[PDB]
Design a protein around this ligand. Structure first.
Ligand SMILES: CC(C)[C@@H](O)[C@H](O)C(=O)NP(=O)(O)OC[C@@H]1C[C@H](O)[C@H](n2cnc3c(N)ncnc32)O1
Ligand SMILES: [Mg+2]
Ligand SMILES: [Mg+2]
Ligand SMILES: [Mg+2]
Ligand SMILES: [Mg+2]
Ligand SMILES: [Mg+2]
Ligand SMILES: [Zn+2]
Length: 860
RNA sequence: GCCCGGAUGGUGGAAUCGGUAGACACAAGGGAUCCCUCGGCGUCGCGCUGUGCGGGUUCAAGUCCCGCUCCGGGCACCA
C-alpha cells in the first residue's frame, strides 16, 4: 500500500475490474430478493453537469447499499435521446441530429463510467433507436384501436415567415429566436391520448403511494384538478347556436351578469363581421402566446360582442363578451361570470361597467358591501328568486336539479388535466404510425410496416423537417391503395414514459416487454430524479404503467414504490442578445461578474466585452448553457472526492446552489482514511478481539463505532440524509485517529472499526473503499461484503446527559444515571453553582422534565 | 397570476418526534502534516443577544400557526 492516496492509480483499475467481472450485470435470479434502483435517464446534450452527478450518485449510493444488504440490484442506464436540442445543435454545427446525439452518448457514457456508477451496461438503451421506438409505435396503434387516441385541433406557436412550429422555449417575448417577427397561434390537428380516461385512477392511487413525498402527491392532485360542477347551456338571441359553460359554483348562478367567450369562438367571429373594434381585438388575440403563465398575467381585456345570452332562470338578456383570457381548446370556449362573488370577474366588470349583482349575504345576514371587492365566501343566497335562504350545498343541489329538469344543465365532473398532446412537427423524434389513404380515411400504420423508421441520414435547414420536405418519404400502400404516412413525430415524453420497463428486457425482440422479466423486476423500488419532473413526467409515467397493466403486460397498479426527488442543482445563468435578435447564453465559468455585499451579482460581462443579462440562479440546463461539467474536478481530485462532496454538501431533497469551494473537505477526509488504514495495516495482522476483556476506554470507542453503524444505516436507509451519514463517519474517523494502537486489543478494535468505516463509505467512495478493503484483508470484493450491523450489547449506556435550563436558558449539563428519578435530577441540578445562582431568591413555579434529556425549572 | 418548495455564522450545512442553536466541513485569522480561534454586542473561569422580516400558540419555536419580503421548481412544445 502506497502511503499517498492516488486516485489516478486506483479509480480506473477498479472500473476496469467491474467491467471485466461484469460486477453490476444482473439477471432474473429467483434465489435473491430483487431491488430495482432507477435513476431518471440522461438526455445526451453533450456533457454531464452537476445535476446529473447528484442524481446518479444518490442512485449509486443506494444501489451499492442494497447490494451490500444481499439484494440483486438492477441499476440501469440509458439515453433519452430524441428531442429539440439535437435539432438546433445540428444546424449550427453542420451535422445531423443522429450523429450528434450518438457522439454525445459516447462522451457522456465515458464520463459516467469515470464516476464509477455501478450500472448494468448490458441493459443500455438509446430511445432514438428503432429497436426501442418500434414498440411505442406498435403500442400507439393498439391504443388507437382501443379508442384511447383521437385527433383534434390544438394551438401551436407559429412563425408566419419561417412557417415553423415553435416550442415555448424558442418563443422569446412573443417573438422568435431566429429572425424577428410576431409569433402567432395557429390551430393545428394533432393526436391526443386520453389520459383523462385515467384521471380518477391517477388521482386516487396517490393514496397508496405512502413512500412518495406529499410535495409531489399534492402538485399532482392540483394539476389533475378534479372538480364537481354543472354544465349550463344558454340560448343566444340572434344566433342559432347555444353556448355552454361549466361552473363549480352553480349556487351563485342568479348573479351571473355576463358571459365571456374566447377570441376564436364562432359567436365572436360572427359578431366580428359587423364590428371593427371586435375584429381588431380577435386579431390581437392570435398573438396571445400558448403558455398558462402568460394567459394569467396579461392585462385582462374584453370587447362586447353585441350578442345577448338569455339567463335560463331569470330570463334577462346578458351580454356576451369576447375575452383574451378564455380559450377555445380548454373547454366549451365560454365561461360565465359572477362578479359579485368571483374577484377576477369583479375586476373585469369594474373595468367595463358590467353589472355587479349580489346574491350571497354577508356573514351577519346583511347585504354585502361590494363597492371595493367581491364577496368570495360561500354563504346564504338572496336576490335569487326561489333559491333565497339556501346555503351552498342546498343551492348547488336546488339549482342543479332545476337546470337539469329544464334540460339546460347537468352535473358534470371536470378535470384541469387535459389530454396528452403527443404530436410534434419536428424531425428528431419517433414517427407517429398513422396513415391517410387515398380514400381520405385515416388508420394506423399496418403491423407489417412497423417500425416506421426515421431516416437518420439527413440534410437539415432549421425550417422544415426532412420527412416533411421529401415528397417520396411519406408514400406507402395500405389496403391495396396509395397512402401517406404521418410526418409528425412523437412528444419525447413518450419514450421516457416506459423506458423503466424496457430496461428489464432491452434485447427482447418478440414484444415490447418480456412480462416474465418485467414482473421479476417491477415495480421500481426507488425512482431517483429531480423535483423538476414531479408533475408532467411522473404523471405520464404512472399513466403508461397503467396502460400496460391494462394490456396485461404488468402486474402492479403503480410503477414505483418509492420516489426520491432531489432538489435542483442551480447555477448562475447569463445571456447577451446577438446582432440578429437571438439570446446567446454564456457559461458562468466565462462570465466576469462584480458582486454585492450580500453576494448578489450586480454587473456581468463576457470576456469578449458583451454585456450579460443575469437571469438568476436556475437549474443547471442544456438550454441555458449554465451546466457545470464535473470532468475537471474528477480529473483533479478523483471521482470518489466529487461523489462524496456532492453527497456531503446538502441533503438530496434541498435545492443546491452549486459551488466548487468545499471539495477540499471531501478530498482531505479521504486522505485521512487512507492514512489511518495505511498506518494500521503497516503494523500487520491483528489478534481476534476479546470483547469480554475490554477497557472502559476501549468499550467507549467500540460503543461509538456501533452507534455510528446504526446511525449511518438509518440515515441512508430510512431518512436518505446522506450528508449527515457522512458527518457521522467523519466524527468516528476523528475519534479513531486519536485512538491508541500499541496493544493487541487496541489494534483488534481498530481492525473492526476500520472494516466498518470502509464498508459504510463504500456507497459514496467505492474506488478507495474497494482498495482499502483489500488492504484490511476483508473477505472478497467489497461490492459483495455484508453491510455492517450494529450490536445492541456493544452500545448500552448507564449514564445520560441532562441539560439543565432555568427559565429556558441552559445553565448546566450533568450526567445522570439512566434509572434516576426527576427528584434526583433536581437535587443534582441544585448542586451546580450556575443553577443555584438563578434559583436564589426565587420560587420554582413549574418543573419540566424530559426524562434523560432536559430539566427546565421555571422560576420567579 | 396559480400550485409546490425555500431563507440558520464569511460559506455549505446540523439540530430526526416542539426540548443544548451553529454538529460536520469549507474559508479566514493565529500558533507549531498537526493544534487553536472563529454569529454579534458587552462582569469573559461571565452575561446579553441571535435561525430572512412582522406577529401568535406553548414552560419552550430553527421546528407548529397567520402574515410580509426575497428566491427556486412547475405551469402542459425544454426534457
Ligand atoms: C426521465 C426523463 C423525462 C428525464 O430524465 C429527461 O430525460 C431529462 O431530464 N434528462 P436530463 O436533463 O439529462 O436529466 C436527467 C435527470 C433528470 C433529473 O431531474 C436530473 N437532473 C437534471 N438536471 C438537474 C438539475 N439541474 N438538478 C438536479 N437534477 C437534475 O437528472
Ligand atoms: Mg442557506
Ligand atoms: Mg444566511
Ligand atoms: Mg433549540
Ligand atoms: Mg455564541
Ligand atoms: Mg427572525
Ligand atoms: Zn421567426
Amino acid at each position: 500500500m502506497q502511503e499517498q492516496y492516488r486516485p489516478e492509480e486506483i479509480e480506473s483499475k477498479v472500473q476496469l475490474h467491474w467491467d471485466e467481472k461484469r460486477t453490476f450485470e444482473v439477471t432474473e435470479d429467483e434465489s435473491k430478493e430483487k431491488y430495482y434502483c432507477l435513476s431518471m435517464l440522461p438526455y445526451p446534450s453533450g456533457r454531464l453537469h452537476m445535476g446529473h452527478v447528484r442524481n446518479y450518485t444518490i442512485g449509486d449510493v443506494i444501489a451499492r447499499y442494497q447490494r451490500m444488504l444481499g439484494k440483486n440490484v438492477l441499476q440501469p442506464i440509458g439515453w433519452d435521446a430524441f428531442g429539440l436540442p439535437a435539432e438546433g445543435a445540428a444546424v449550427k454545427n453542420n451535422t445531423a441530429p443522429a450523429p450528434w446525439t450518438y457522439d454525445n452518448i459516447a462522451y457522456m457514457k465515458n464520463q459516467l463510467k469515470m464516476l464509477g456508477f455501478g450500472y448494468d451496461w448490458s441493459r443500455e438503451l438509446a430511445t432514438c433507436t428503432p429497436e426501442y421506438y418500434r414498440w411505442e409505435q406498435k403500442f400507439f396503434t393498439e391504443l388507437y384501436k382501443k379508442g384511447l387516441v383521437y385527433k383534434k385541433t390544438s394551438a401551436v406557436n407559429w412563425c408566419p415567415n419561417d412557417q415553423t412550429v415553435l416550442a415555448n422555449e424558442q418563443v422569446i417575448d412573443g417573438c422568435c429566436w431566429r429572425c424577428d417577427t410576431k409569433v402567432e397561434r395557429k390551430e393545428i390537428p394533432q393526436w391526443f391520448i386520453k389520459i383523462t380516461a385515467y384521471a380518477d385512477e391517477l388521482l386516487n392511487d396517490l393514496d397508496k403511494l405512502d413512500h412518495w413525498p406529499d410535495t409531489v402527491k399534492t402538485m399532482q392532485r392540483n394539476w389533475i384538478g378534479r372538480s364537481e360542477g354543472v354544465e349550463i347551456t344558454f340560448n343566444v338571441n340572434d344566433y342559432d347556436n347555444t353556448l355552454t359553460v361549466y361552473t363549480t359554483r352553480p349556487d351563485t348562478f342568479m348573479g351571473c351578469t355576463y358571459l365571456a367567450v374566447a377570441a376564436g369562438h364562432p359567436l365572436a367571429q360572427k359578431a366580428a363581421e359587423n364590428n371593427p373594434e371586435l375584429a381588431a381585438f380577435i386579431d390581437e388575440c392570435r398573438n396571445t402566446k400558448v403558455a398558462e403563465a402568460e394567459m394569467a398575467t396579461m392585462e385582462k381585456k374584453g370587447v362586447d360582442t353585441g350578442f345577448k345570452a338569455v339567463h335560463p332562470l331569470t330570463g334577462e338578456e346578458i351580454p356576451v363578451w369576447a375575452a383574451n383570457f378564455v380559450l377555445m381548446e380548454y373547454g366549451t370556449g365560454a365561461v360565465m361570470a359572477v362578479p359579485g362573488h368571483d374577484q377576477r370577474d369583479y375586476e373585469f366588470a369594474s373595468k367595463y361597467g358590467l353589472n355587479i349583482k349580489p346574491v350571497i349575504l354577508a356573514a351577519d345576514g346583511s347585504e354585502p358591501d361590494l363597492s371595493q371587492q367581491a364577496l368570495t365566501e360561500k354563504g346564504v343566497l338572496f336576490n335569487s328568486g326561489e333559491f333565497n335562504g339556501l346555503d351552498h350545498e342546498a343551492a348547488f343541489n336546488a339549482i342543479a336539479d332545476k337546470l337539469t329538469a329544464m334540460g339546460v344543465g347537468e352535473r358534470k365532473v371536470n378535470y384541469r388535466l387535459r389530454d396528452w398532446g403527443v404530436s410534434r412537427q419536428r424531425y428528431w423524434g419517433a414517427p407517429i404510425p398513422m396513415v391517410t389513404l387515398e380514400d381520405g380515411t385515416v388508420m394506423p400504420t399496418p403491423d407489417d410496416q412497423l417500425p416506421v423508421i426515421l431516416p437518420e441520414d439527413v440534410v437539415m435547414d432549421g425550417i422544415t423537417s426532412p420527412i416533411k420536405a421529401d415528397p417520396e418519404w411519406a408514400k406507402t400502400t395500405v389496403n391495396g391503395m396509395p397512402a401517406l404516412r404521418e410526418t409528425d413525430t412523437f412528444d419525447t415524453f413518450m419514450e421516457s414514459s416506459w423506458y423503466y420497463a424496457r430496461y428489464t428486457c432491452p434485447q427482447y425482440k418478440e414484444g415490447m416487454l418480456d412480462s416474465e422479466a418485467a414482473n421479476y423486476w417491477l415495480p421500481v423500488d426507488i425512482y431517483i430524479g429531480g423535483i423538476e419532473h414531479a408533475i408532467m413526467h411522473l404523471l405520464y409515467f404512472r399513466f403508461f404503467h397503467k396502460l400496460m397493466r391494462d394490456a396485461g403486460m404488468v402486474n402492479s397498479d403503480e410503477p414505483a414504490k418509492q420516489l426520491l426527488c432531489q432538489g435542483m442543482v442551480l447555477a448562475d445563468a447569463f445571456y447577451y442578445v446577438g446582432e440578429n435578435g437571438e439570446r446567446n447564453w454564456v457559461s458562468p465559468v466565462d462570465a466576469i461578474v462584480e458582486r454585492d455585499e450580500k453576494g448578489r451579482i450586480v454587473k456581468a460581462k463576457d470576456a469578449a466585452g458583451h454585456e450579460l443579462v443575469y437571469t438568476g440562479m436556475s437549474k443547471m440546463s442544456k438550454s441555458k448553457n449554465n451546466g457545470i461539467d464535473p470532468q475537471v474536478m474528477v480529473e483533479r481530485y478523483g471521482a470518489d472526492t466529487v461523489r462524496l462532496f456532492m453527497m456531503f454538501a446538502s441533503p438530496a431533497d434541498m435545492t443546491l446552489e452549486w459551488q466548487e469551494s468545499g471539495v477540499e473537505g471531501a478530498n482531505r477526509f479521504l486522505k485521512r482514511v487512507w492514512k489511518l488504514v495505511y498506518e494500521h495495516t503497516a503494523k500487520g495482522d491483528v489478534a481476534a478481539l476479546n470483547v469480554d476483556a475490554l477497557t472502559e476506554n476501549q468499550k467507549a470507542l467500540r460503543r461509538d463505532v456501533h452507534k455510528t453503524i446504526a446511525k449511518v444505516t438509518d440515515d441512508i436507509g430510512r431518512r436518505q440524509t446522506f450528508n449527515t451519514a457522512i458527518a457521522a463517519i467523519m466524527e468516528l474517523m476523528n475519534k479513531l485517529a486519536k485512538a491508541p494502537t500499541d496493544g493487541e486489543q487496541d489494534r483488534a478494535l481498530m481492525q473492526e472499526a476500520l472494516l466498518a468505516v470502509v464498508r459504510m463509505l463504500n456507497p459514496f467512495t467505492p474506488h478507495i473503499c474497494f482498495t482499502l478493503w483489500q488492504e484490511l484483508k476483508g473477505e472478497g470484493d467489497i461490492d459483495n461484503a455484508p453491510w455492517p450491523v450494529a450490536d445492541e450489547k456493544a452500545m448500552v449506556e448507564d449514564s445520560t446527559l441532562v441539560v439543565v435550563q432555568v427559565n429556558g436558558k441552559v445553565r448546566a449539563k450533568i450526567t445522570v444515571p439512566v434509572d434516576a428519578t426527576e427528584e434526583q435530577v433536581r437535587e443534582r441540578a441544585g448542586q451546580e453553582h450556575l443553577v443555584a445562582k438563578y434559583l436564589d431568591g426565587v420560587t420554582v413555579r413549574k418543573v419540566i422534565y424530559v426524562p434523560g434529556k432536559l430539566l427546565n425549572l421555571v422560576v420567579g
